[PDB]
Amino acid sequence: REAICIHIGQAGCQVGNACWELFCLEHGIQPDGAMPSDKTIGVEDDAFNTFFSETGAGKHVPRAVFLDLEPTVVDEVRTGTYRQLFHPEQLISGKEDAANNYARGHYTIGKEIVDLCLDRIRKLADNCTGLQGFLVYHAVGGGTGSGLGALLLERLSVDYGKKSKLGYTVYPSPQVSTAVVEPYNSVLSTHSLLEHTDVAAMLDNEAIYDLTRRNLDIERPTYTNLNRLIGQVVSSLTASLRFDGALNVDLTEFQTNLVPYPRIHFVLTSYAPVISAEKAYHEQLSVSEISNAVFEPASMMTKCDPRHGKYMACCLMYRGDVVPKDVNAAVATIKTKRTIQFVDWSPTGFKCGINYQPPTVVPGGDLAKVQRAVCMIANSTAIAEVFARIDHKFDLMYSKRAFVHWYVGEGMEEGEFSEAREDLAALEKDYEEVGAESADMD
Amino acid sequence: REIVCVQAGQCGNQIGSKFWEVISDEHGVDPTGTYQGDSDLQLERINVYFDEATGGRYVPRSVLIDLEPGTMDSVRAGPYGQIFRPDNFIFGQSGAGNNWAKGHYTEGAELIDSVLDVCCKEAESCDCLQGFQICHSLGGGTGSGMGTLLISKLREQYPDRIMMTFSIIPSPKVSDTVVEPYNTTLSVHQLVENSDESMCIDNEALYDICFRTLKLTTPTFGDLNHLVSAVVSGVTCCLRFPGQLNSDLRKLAVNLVPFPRLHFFMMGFAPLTSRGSQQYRGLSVPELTQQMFDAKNMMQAADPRHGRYLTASALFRGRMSTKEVDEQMLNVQNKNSSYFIEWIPNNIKSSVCDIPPKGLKMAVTFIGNNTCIQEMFRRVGEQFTLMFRRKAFLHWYTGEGMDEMEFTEAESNMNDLVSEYQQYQDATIE
C-alpha cells in the first residue's frame, strides 16, 4: 500500500515538482490540500492513501522529503504554488552546495545533514502500516546527489534492512555534459550503488532530448518536458498499486524477476505512445503497434543500443483498455524477431502486467491523450558499453591526477579512486562472463 | 551567502564606484539607499551585497583604502557616494610614491591594522561568509603593496573561503609610470602563492574593445571601469537569483583549476554592439556563443590562438532553453578539437540563470583558463630584465630597505610559473 519518495538535489527536486503535480491531478487533491466540495459522488474514496495521508480535518499531505544543500531550489518550492501542500519539516535545506565534489557531500557536509533526513524519514515510516519500498530520485553527476544519495541509501540499508530501495538515476550523457569532473563522481557513486540498491533505472538527457525532438514536435525543449516524461513513467510503474487491473505487480516483483545475480541490477527503461496531437489524428494506436514501439531503440531513455547485447529479462507494464490475448499475440511476435536475442540460460524471458486506469492528461502537457500505454524495464548486457566509456574518461584524467587534490583536501584517500576503478573493471568482466552461452562451454 | 568587497587605490576605488552603481541599479536601490524596486525577486537576495540600516536604508559591504585622500573626496562627491558608510573610508597622509616597498613596508604597516579591523567587522557580521572580492592595479604603489599585504592577512585568517582578485597589469605599449615592472613582478609573486583564482585585465584590451566593437568616439576611464563592473556583477548573478542550473564561485573554482597554481583566467562579456548596428541583430544563443569566443571580445592582450584551453565556463542569464546551450557547447567542442587540451575529455561547464540584467533580454559571461597567459608574464619579465641588469632605479627600493635577493626571488617565481604553464601546454598522453 504505502510508498515513500525521497528527492535529492536539483534534478531530484525539480522532477519531484512534476511528479507531485501529476499525482495531485490524477487523484483530485487541490493545491491547498482539500478535495473539492462541489462534487456529490457520495462515495468516500481512499486510493490516494498510497501517496497522501489525511489529518482528520480533511487536508491531504504527501509522503515525501525534499533534500538539498543549497537553499534556493527548496525556497522556490516553499514560495511556489504548492506551498500549502507540504509540511514545512519535509522541506530540508542546507547553507551551501557540495560544489560538484562527491567527497564534500559524503564526508564533510552530508555527514552533518544526514541525521535530520533520517529523522524525517523515520517520522514518515512510523505513520505507515504496509510500507513496501523507497523510491529515490537523484543524479550521480553532481556532488551532493552522488555523495549524500550514496550515504543516505547506505544508512537506510542498514536501518531498514530487507525493505526494497528503487532508484531513478540520471547518468552522464555520452556527449552532452555539464561539468568537467562528472566521471569521478559517477564512478565513486556507482561503487556505493552496486552494494546498496535493489534496482537502478538509468536516464540520459540526450536520449530524452532526441525523443522529444523526433516524436514530439518540440524544437527547443527544456527540463520541464523531461521531468513530465519521468513523472509519467513513475505514474505508470506505481499505477499497479492504486487501481484495479487484470495482472497487478507489486514493487517486490521487480527485484525477483529482473535480477539474476546480485550485482546485475541495472535496467533500461522506455515508454511507447510519446506522440503529438497532430500525429495522433493520423494514426490508430492499437496494442500491437505500441508493443512494437517499445522495442525500437529510438524509444529508449538511455543512450545505449540493446542490439549490441543479449536480454536476460523483460518486464512489460500495460495500462488502459488492453485485453490479455492481444498482449500475448504481440509478445509472441516480438519473440519471433531476429534482432532480439535472449541468453540461453533464460528461456522464460518475460513478465507481464495489465492495469485498467488510462494515463492522466495534464493541462499544460505536451503528450497527446491516448486510451492505452505500455512501459518496459529490461536487463541487457549492452549496458557494459556505458560503463566502459565512463572508465576511459576516468582513466585519461586519472593518468595525470588531474583534479585529485580537491577530493583529497575534502577528506578522501587517493586509494579510493583505484578501488572504485577496479570494482568497475570487475563489473565489466561480470558482464562478459554472464553472457557466454552454455553450449559453447559444454 | 555574503560577499565582502575591498577597493584599493585609485583604479580600484573608481571601478568600485561603477560596480556599486551597477549593483544598485540591478536591485532598484535609490542613491539615498531606499528600496524602490518593483518585484520581490529583487528584494529576496538584497542581503548578499547590502546590509540593512535603520528605517529603510541599505549600506554596501565594502572597504575603501587609499594612501592619499584625493580619490576619497572624489568618490564621496560622486553621484552614489553618499551610500557608503563614513567609517569605511581608510586613508593615510603621504602618498605611495609609485614605490612597492614604500607601499608595503612603511605606510602599509601603519594602516594595515585599521583595514583588518574593518574587514573583520564586516566579516563577523555575516551569518555565512562567502569569498572576498578585491579590485586593484598591479602597476601602482598602494594598490600593489597594500593589496597584496591585505590579501596575505585575509588568507591567514580565512583559509577555507575563496579569495578572488581583479587586477590591472601594465600595458607593454602605453605605460603611465616608469617603475611598473618591479611592482608587477613582486605583486604576481605574492598572488600566485596567495590567490585561489585571479582575473587579469589589460587596459589595451579595453581600448580595443571600445574602439573596434563599440565604436566610441571619445572613450574615458569610466567606460573601461563600466565594462569591468559589468563582468564583476555578472559572475555573482547565479549566487543571488533563481535558475534552472545553479552555479557558485566554489563550483567555478572546482571546475576551472586542475592544479592550485594554474588559477589565472581570461574574461569576456558577450552582448556588446554599437548603437548603429543594434537595429540589425536580435539577441539569440548562437550570437552570444559566437561573440563569447571571439578574441575581439576578450579582456587580455594574449590571444587564445597561441595556446590551448584547459577549462572554460559560461554563465547564461535569461529565459532560454537548456538544449541550445548543451548543443552549442557540444558543437564547439567537437568542431574545434585542436584548441582544447586533449587529456581532459570535456573542457566546458555551462550554467543557466533565469534573471537577466534589466533592459537586456539575455547575457553571458565567459571565464577561460588558457596557457597563453604565460606570454604576458614573460613580456613583463623581459622589461624587468632590461631594467634590472643595469640597476636602473634600484636605490629607491634599497633605501626603503629591500635586499637585492627579493628581486631574484620574484624573477625565479615568475619564471617557474611560466615554466609550469609551458610544461602543461606540451604534455602528452603517451
Binding site: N17, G28, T81, Y82, T222 | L41, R319, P356, K358
Partner: peptide
Amino acid sequence: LHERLSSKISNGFASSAYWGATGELPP
C-alpha cells in the same frame, strides 16, 4: 512606443519552474 518599452522591463523578473502552472483539476 515609450509605454511599450516601459512595460517590456517588468516581465524580465520571472521564475521558470512554475511557468504557466495553475493547478486546476479536470473533471
